[PDB]
Symmetry: C5
Subunit: 311 residues, 5 copies
């Protein structure tokens, strides 16, 4: 089998569509997601044309091996898609209608800057390479692009699944290549981060601030050091669910800043004890009273600054 | 091979059945389960009809390649099922009896709202896409739906395995689609959660309340902060066995609430010490005595409210 | 190819044997084990009979496709076995000798009640489904059941590998099915649990009891709470190596009971401090002295009771 | 099919190229990375030459089975590459242009000496084994070596992808072998290590040094021991992301050195308390005051020495 | 295809060789390692004799399916090897030279008694089962046994790769089996265990001994209990990298012994406090002073005894 010959010198247009059946395993660390979908393909092959009257059939079914089928690949996949051909239908003018159901693990970079209040644009890049006989170009049949209502991505809200209609045509290894960009827009369900990470992290921090109403150095050291350790545990927990980024994430920024608050609270607790030992408690009392206001105030203002820089 | 032609204009009815052999790996985080089962298919193919008197044979056995077989797929699977054809039998009237043994990983969302006292309805969706020649519709042969007595799903009780007899017939990409819903009803074995998570978590909380019978600030800080850290460990343990949900789970609610109790206990311990230092212990004594009753009482009432909202 | 036809109306007897080459990956959480073995099959196919004199051979070697072979399956496997046919030999009277080497992941429930001093009976269920033409029954050739001397299952002692000679014959979807039960009896190597989990857990508990020779509330709180946290770590460690069971395991029972001892030790430490503050130390001394005997005594008796209930 | 015969006695030159499409999963512990790329092959097969004016076709497209193709393998792969042939083009003179898209898991040792400020040279070794008929030698077509602009390796910066043009030709098992070295130069994005590991580790160390402004032994013991435990947690965290090396890494060296600082701080805290108990506080004061300067100074100088030895 | 016929009554000798290309993933817990190697096979099949004059060629190249190939298997593999035939060369007398490149996961028990200062002998067992026509025996072609210079096993030093030239010929299920033992001698790179586990574990132990220069019970309890918890963390860390053994490992013995030292240190700290409270500090001072010498001395002697028993 060889590609359909051109009537003049036109390129062969392969109309494409992706209909999402399943979306699962969005792995943040790996920056991958798994997809199960219908891939539809359509092109004209004159050599397969027939007369409906003398045939007695309005449509003709073929096995993939019997006819020429464009070698369509995905750019951003780990391994080649697992595909099973569903149907191949030919109309009288030789218009081929191809349908396969496939599953693939897609590599798509994620921007963690606003995590866990982030939104992403996942990409599925469709590609075809041209042959010596003719140049093969991809198009989007919008009537064949969509997603099942039951499509759920655990921990995310699916906003839209659209295709950029104009392909990116370019040369690669002395042949032209036609690339389509299918975009799946998603937004993270931040809900669970609030009772599981955010609030627990704030509670332990506020507990360290009770040291500003205590003159007991031994108790103060216990309050600040114990909560710091619990903060380290949350830092470790958070970083294990995320990849290493060459930039600061919103959560990473807050987590890092909270260390500074623990560090300054230890300085305050130290200074307070030092003055008490030096028989200067009136002074220590002035520093401690100021700290009661300064710590929550600087914490609120630093958070307003951070939220501003990130959102 | 082509589909059996209609005598009139009727759709082809494919009778189905699923007999569960094995159920394993119910993964809460992934919202998946693995299944090993018999899939039975039955349809009439008049082209295969024969005479039983002259053939001397009551049944004819065919190899899958020799005859037309409907392309039946599962909707909610990760990858296409791993199937091995067991038997194909044709009766004299041309009724085909197909049997395969398959294994598949099924995506089925779980409702964690009542965790670990939750029940689930797992779904296995069977599907067939109509061909151009004719419309294919699915039916349930209840005589061929069931499960082996030895079917066990570790950590769960299997209640029932039934099929919704009426298929969901709908158009998808300009063809008809016929979908059947096989339902596996299960209830979680909550037993182990009691000695492993629930009771240990209650013991550490009750240990924090011994601070209400102590005037030692240093010891109190140690009691409340140490148990809080142990509570954090249980929170982390629990959340690692669960996916992130856009709702509160029953266990999540209790775990979150317990932080408030630790926070208020720290306030009490702080207020008590502050008054003692200010030479007001009679007052501190009134707050501490009230706390001895208030803490267990508010804990019980808050739990009654939560159990009511969730069950 | 079709099954051997019956001389009268007898079922076809397929003689079986399993010879274990490798046993590995006994996963307690998954309740699975991996096996690599020889599967031997033997049956009479008269159509294959020959005269040794005429042919000039005592045996005939065929390829699997050339002759009829029974469709033998394993019941309790994750996926169908990975098999490679080793040999097919036909004797003059049509006695077929089939040999394959296979590997499979077996699902076999485990009874954790006596963990880590438990013994198990792993099962490998062999099955055959009858055909329209012939009822197929399985038998055990004891001469072909065994295991290699080098067969080792890490963390277990292999006791015996035997087959229940009488198959379990039953109807499944209007066809006879013949099931054989191959049993691999194993006993857990409990050795390592002693220095790694049991003794460390006892040491920290005994360390909490040193609080009965101390009047220092602050030191007592540190002793009991710190060791309780270390006990929580062991509880978590143990539960990660085990599945969730709807029953108490021996280790689970001891681990749970030890929490009660920590809880009562905190009550004692609290009561002691309370009396000391109330200027009643003579009393506190009576409770503390009683506790020094009561705690180890009640611990020993409770352990005797538990060992009795479990063994 | 057999290899193209030599006109004289020359070896067959197979021109190669690798064009990277995807780079993912650089696993530090495993010392592996996954690759998805185009592999291009070119050689002269005179038996395939044709007339351009007579044939009318400028290029002939063959199926892999139809012609002889060199058996090209990767040396440093876990399993054989997953490959799909894209195109085979023959020019009139018999110059074959072969193109496949492959995916593979590559074993490439990493030098962790300067971690997390390390750079690596990943290798992909291409190999061909000669046949009895003739010797096969590999060459690099630089025009067909490259990488897609979108190629991203999470946590790394990609510097260059080049090939050492001269193959390593050697005898192995009495036949010639021709090996090419494709080099992917990368540098680690150390950014995230600063707020996640480095700074938190420095903060806890500096917190241990507040004990030099405290006379409270009980508080000092709490400060030094608590922070030491947090240092152990960071040591464990770091070592889990790295393989075991027969050399010290930069981070490993700093982490190890910090233990010595904790050990000496405990000695200081002990010596200070001992002198205070012996009624020699003036002296303890001399040691403590010296420690305030000595600890940060020795820490800075030791770090300058270490950075010098490693960079 | 059938086996080559015997000229007399001799068994068919299949000469073997294994040339290691890659060694990776030595998993201590699983007691497995992955291998990528050349497997060479050589046997005489006179039925394949040819005249170079008539056929033109000096050596014939065959496809595996075209000729008889001995069914060679590995005994100690998880699954059957992934093999790719590189060449099948037949010389005029009928001597076949078979070459394949394979990858396999090998089960080979490890002796952890001296861990992490242990050495191992990994085995790769090659096997052939005899057929009816004739008995097959394996031999080692030493000229075809070896390893690539670049063969590295992360965390190990490779000493030698040799074959026991004499096969183990034995009866199995009424047929002969011929087994060869390929041995890969390795020694563990213990380096990293010193700064990561050994020294940190010794530092925390020595820190607990500072309690022998302190009269502060509250500080002593903190020193001994905190370092004990850090010791538990190292115990858990070590045991996660190792399988459960029915014997004591060297590291396991040291780790276990260190618990006894913590237990006795708690007794000492308790006894000291008890005497101080009873107004007997002179006695307490005698016990504490003795402990300063006894603890490091008994620790050194116990380690000399342990090293002697293990090495
Ligand atoms: C610790 C500090 C407290 C956490 C700060 C909240 C984060 C935030 O400010 O979140 C803000 C985001 C909304 O972002 P958006 O509309 O998606 O961004 C795009 C917006 N632009 C394009 C205009 C820039 O989420 C929320 O709905 C807030 C819910 C979080 C409540 C946390 C309470 C505790
Ligand atoms: C701290 C709070 C402790 C947890 C309290 C139990 C939670 C609960 O209330 O559990 C209730 C569930 C029963 O649920 P159900 O009948 O399946 O629900 C469906 C019923 N509808 C449809 C009527 C709403 O479990 C039990 O049998 C309780 C036994 C566990 C006791 C744990 C003791 C500790
Ligand atoms: C904390 C309490 C300490 C743990 C108590 C040991 C558990 C036990 O009681 O173990 C008992 C089992 C014996 O089991 P069996 O004979 O196989 O069972 C079948 C018996 N029937 C049929 C009679 C019921 O193992 C042992 O040899 C125990 C040796 C380890 C001692 C632990 C040292 C600490
Ligand atoms: C505790 C001590 C803190 C860590 C010290 C920095 C490590 C270092 O010295 O880092 C040095 C590397 C630069 O490396 P380079 O030029 O690529 O090396 C190759 C150069 N040769 C060939 C000349 C040798 O990183 C940096 O850019 C420094 C940024 C890190 C700041 C960390 C602050 C905390
Ligand atoms: C805590 C106790 C400290 C552990 C002491 C080292 C263990 C040991 O004794 O290690 C010994 C092994 C050498 O063993 P070998 O020659 O391979 O054994 C075979 C010997 N036969 C055949 C004679 C029996 O390692 C070494 O090279 C020593 C380096 C380790 C230094 C650790 C410093 C801390
Ligand atoms: Cl693809
Ligand atoms: Cl399916
Ligand atoms: Cl099977
Ligand atoms: Cl390869
Ligand atoms: Cl093998
Ligand atoms: Na085609
Ligand atoms: Na068919
Ligand atoms: Na057959
Ligand atoms: Na070829
Ligand atoms: Na303390
Ligand atoms: Na063969």
């Amino acid at each position: 089998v060889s590609p359909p010959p051109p009537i003049a010198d036109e390129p062969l247009t392969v109309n494409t569509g992706i209909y999402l059946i399943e979306c699962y395993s969005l792995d943040d660390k790996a920056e991958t997601f798994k997809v199960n979908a219908f891939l539809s393909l359509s092109w004209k092959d004159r050599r397969l044309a027939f007369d409906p009257v003398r045939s007695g059939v309005r449509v003709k079914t073929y096995e993939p091996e019997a006819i020429w089928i464009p070698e369509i690949r995905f750019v951003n996949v780990e391994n080649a898609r697992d595909a099973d051909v569903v149907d191949i239908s030919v109309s009288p003018d030789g218009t081929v209608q191809y349908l396969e159901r496939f599953s693939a693990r897609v590599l798509s970079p994620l921007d963690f800057r606003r995590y866990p209040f982030d939104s992403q644009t996942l990409h599925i890049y469709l590609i075809v390479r041209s042959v010596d006989t003719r140049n093969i170009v991809l198009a989007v049949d919008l009537e064949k692009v969509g997603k099942n209502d039951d499509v759920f991505l655990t921990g995310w809200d699916i906003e839209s699944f659209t295709a950029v209609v104009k392909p990116a045509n370019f040369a690669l290894e002395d042949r032209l290549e036609s690339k389509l960009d299918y975009q799946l827009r998603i937004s993270r369900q931040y809900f669970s981060y609030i009772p599981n990470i955010i609030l627990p992290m704030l509670f332990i921090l506020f507990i360290s601030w009770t040291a500003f109403w205590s003159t007991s150095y031994e108790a103060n050291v216990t309050l600040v050091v114990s909560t710091l350790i619990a903060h380290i545990a949350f830092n470790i927990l958070v970083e294990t669910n995320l990849p290493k980024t060459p930039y600061m994430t919103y959560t990473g920024a807050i987590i890092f800043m909270i260390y500074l608050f623990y560090f300054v609270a230890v300085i305050e607790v130290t200074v307070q004890h030092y003055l008490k030992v030096e028989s200067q408690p009136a002074r220590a009392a002035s520093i401690t009273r100021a700290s009661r206001i300064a710590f929550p105030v600087v914490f609120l203002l630093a958070n307003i600054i951070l939220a501003f820089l990130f959102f």
